[PDB]
């Protein structure tokens, strides 16, 4: 029982970490020693009070996405939403949705994308996100509802991936606040990456175990 | 664009109808002529403000049954909840879920109803629950939770729908205000049957075109 979907927020170095029914939100420290839980563990349907009668609110959530303002999209298997989640406040309300990933992403049916994402993060190009399914990844306009580039392999557009574990996929990922880099998390393991928008880029580079620099998810990672 | 999902109400003489995304309340009137659309055709989400928000406003319902009091299990592919549906007013309520099928009723995991039921009707024994999806159905008992009953075809626990189009699947379903009679749907066609708990009795045979006989869904069935 891993991080199974995150997404960046409206607050600065604040991300949202959706484990099983649950989430925690995060004070990352991606620059500064004193990473720390301002929130959760607490289960999706009772801090989201919107989601408490939803799938989202019986399962959680299994991919996820920051938009703009606090909004964000978040998924369960063919299913999602587009959310407002009202950070540090109680205001949360369902935008669109729950609608079926192809009938809110039309340009994903006959893809792998159609019936479940494992991760998502929020890239820096206007309204870009980068989208990952087993060895697949894709480039998508949230805004325009477009495809911008074909369905490719993660090690395409994310080289510095090839030979480690995130070769065949991410079981979690999100932004941050630090321009062009990104979060990614698989089983017990986290990466941190530079990556730059429409270019064949590297580094890193350094991959890490996750609650060797994450104190603030010991006891809460593994949630079993 | 026909019948999808039925469940008795517990208002004598009235049946609730789920076609696409939109519902209609009705006065079935088996002892008489004097048939009516009591509510609609309204959408699930208008209807039904406890599902405004869920998988079944934005998509309807595709099976359904009565269980006791003004209560009644919904369903859409793998999920369903049971609700309060608080027959003619503003407070109608989500009782349990949305679950899985398989967490709903655990017995389903493993064989077709899993991933979707096609139709349901109360039994008058009991808690008793009759499930159908394709060819095959099951005996429930909702209240302890369990299958009373290996999953047969139709055909072997119906024998009075041998060689009728219902021999290979029913769309809908719900079971009369009047002992031991159910009625059943797939495309323009319907029947009234008249059913004993554990037997092989056969008849009725009444298979008729549903617009000839239900004068109040002319310009509802088919819904474009
Ligand atoms: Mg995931
Ligand atoms: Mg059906």
Redesign the pocket.
Known sequence: GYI??AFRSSRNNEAYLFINDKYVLLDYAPGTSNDKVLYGPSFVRDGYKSLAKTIFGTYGI??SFDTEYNEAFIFYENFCARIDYAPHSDKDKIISGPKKIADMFPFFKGTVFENGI??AFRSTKGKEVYLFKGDKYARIDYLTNRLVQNIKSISDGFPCLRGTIFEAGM??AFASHKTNEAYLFKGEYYARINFTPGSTNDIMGGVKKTLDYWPSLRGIIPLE
């Open positions: 199974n979907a299994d991919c494992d991760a079981d979690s």
